[PDB]
Amino acid sequence: SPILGYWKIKGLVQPTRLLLEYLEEKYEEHLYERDLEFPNLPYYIDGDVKLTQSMAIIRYIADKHNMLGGCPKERAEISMLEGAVLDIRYGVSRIAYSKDFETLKVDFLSKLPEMLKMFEDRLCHKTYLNGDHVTHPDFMLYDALDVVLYMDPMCLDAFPKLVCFKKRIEAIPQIDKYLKSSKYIAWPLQGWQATFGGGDHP
């Protein structure tokens, strides 16, 4: 059975866990708690491959299920959505370990509406980000939305399509079951030492 190793946090691997549950893949986790030889996190091991880099890991899983895109144009479209979600999610992580977080968050939250609106407009004519069918950037976006809502519970008040998308992802039977399961890591969002999304509880 494939092994996914990471900290016992949401962090970089949360969209990968959602994708795996969506696909009903069987996998074990190595969960590293607060306290090959270090090692390098996250990693993903099945028979064939040994991977590091969270984006290589999620892309591989998507790739094994033919979800990366059927032609160069489609695959670039998916890569583009990926990069656009990462600007949000990395935007959070970039400031979440600062003593100055309270200041830096002002800048971040000022730029967030424009970042969100691309996804909003995209969602006005598509059910999921790439259309009728779920793709891996959908779970990346879900994770980014979950994280920013802890930063600003109001940040989606002006985005009803994104509000709807978040509920839609939550209603996928595999996902709804996973979020209610004992497998679900609710918190922390970042490493425990973080000023935002760290600590033991919300």
Add this chain to the structure above:
Amino acid sequence: SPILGYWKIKGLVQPTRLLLEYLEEKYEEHLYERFPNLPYYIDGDVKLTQSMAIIRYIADKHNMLGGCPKERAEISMLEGAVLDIRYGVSRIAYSKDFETLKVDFLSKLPEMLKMFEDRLCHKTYLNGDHVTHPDFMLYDALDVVLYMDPMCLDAFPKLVCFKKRIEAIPQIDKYLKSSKYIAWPLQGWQATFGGGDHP
């Protein structure tokens, strides 16, 4: 002709430029001096943003991303590992605290480079006998960290060899000596590191 739009800097687009030159693709640039999301790439029906989507698209058109999920993952892994270096520079380059943040980065750098050094002991390029897009990403990353610290490759003779091997590819050698080459800046002009009009 495809159009590549970006600031007139090296920045996020330099490896893409090296890939297009490697492949001898005819392309036009829109070079912004001194409003569109940058970079953009426009060929016939595709209009792309996000620099990773662009370089991967160009690679994809030339069948260079990988033949199976395993090989594609390996290339994405290489990609992500180069970006840890390149973005690592970028994230401190604009800080008032650059000089102090530099110390931490240069202390973490040998650890990052060693992975590439080992991988290059028994392969000519990152993925073996043939060039892939992460080679040009690595080239750009090496060029950048050498301005930060001229001696940071002294412990890495296989990386020093690799950088010269890339420069000796005839397309690359020619492009580097051409009028199209943008030598400087490495970052936005306003950066503390790799900014300004000249080195």
